[PDB]
Paper text:
Using X-ray crystallography, we show that the ciliopathy-associated centriolar protein CEP120 contains three C2 domains. CEP120, for example, plays a key role in the duplication, elongation, and maturation of centrioles, which in principle could impact the production of a functional basal body (Comartin et al., 2013, Lin et al., 2013, Mahjoub et al., 2010, Wu et al., 2014). All three C2 domains of CEP120 (C2A, C2B, and C2C) adopt the PLC δ1-like topology II and are structurally similar to each other (root-mean-square deviation [RMSD], 2.4–2.6 Å), with major differences found mainly in their loop length.
For the O.n.-A200P mutant (equivalent to the H.s.-A199P JATD mutation), we obtained diffraction-quality crystals that allowed a successful structure determination to a resolution of 2.1 Å. Furthermore, the crystal structure of O.n. CEP120 C2B G307S did not reveal significant structural differences when compared to the corresponding wild-type (WT) structure (RMSD, 0.19 Å with 181 aligned residue pairs).
Numbering used by the authors: 166 to 346
Write the structure that this text describes.
């Protein structure tokens, strides 16, 4: 059968693997830390000037819809670093295998009901380095490039270098009793 993260509603954790064999608590977390060059994802300077310009990040973490704190300053981002975490009851081996099999997390920069761009954050990459979970948290931290949903990207003026929209993300897996530090 397919390894699936099964919400236990009353308890507020997700069971991964058979509940009698997979009984340890883990925390899986996503942190959006900073961003730059986001203005490339908005075609019109005038949209930045409107106050309806309220931007936030969205992603689905094991089937949970997560939105971040809205911010207005797209050209000079001022959102605070923000973490969302889920609790998982599983075993080391089963959870590591489960994460290695998950599709990438897709984090979207949104305005209202529109996605302006998204980036792929590998959970399998995190599983691959989750090799000492009895003793330490495992973290993948990187600057991820946001891609607009359009077919053609136009750049004016075209320069030799290409500073692109970037989102700093950290994804972490740890045993619940192992402090992040």
């Amino acid at each position: 059968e397919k390894l699936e993260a099964i919400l236990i509603p009353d308890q507020g954790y997700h069971q991964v693997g058979p509940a009698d064999l997979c009984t340890d608590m883990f925390v899986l977390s996503v942190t959006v830390a900073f961003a730059t060059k986001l203005e490339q994802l908005v075609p019109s300077t005038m949209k930045l000037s409107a106050e309806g310009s309220e931007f936030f990040f969205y992603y689905s973490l094991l089937g949970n819809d997560i939105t971040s704190e809205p911010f207005h300053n797209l050209l000079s981002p001022d959102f605070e670093p923000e973490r969302a975490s889920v609790r998982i009851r599983s075993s080391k081996q089963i959870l590591k295998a489960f994460l290695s099999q998950q599709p990438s997390l897709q984090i979207h920069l949104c305005c209202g009901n529109h996605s302006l761009g998204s980036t792929d954050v590998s959970l399998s990459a995190l599983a691959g380095i989750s090799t000492d979970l009895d003793n330490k948290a495992a973290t993948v931290e990187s600057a991820f490039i946001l891609q607009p949903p359009k077919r053609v990207k136009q750049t004016l003026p075209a320069l030799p270098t290409d500073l692109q929209p970037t989102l700093g993300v950290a994804v972490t897996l740890r045993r619940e009793e192992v402090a992040l530090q």
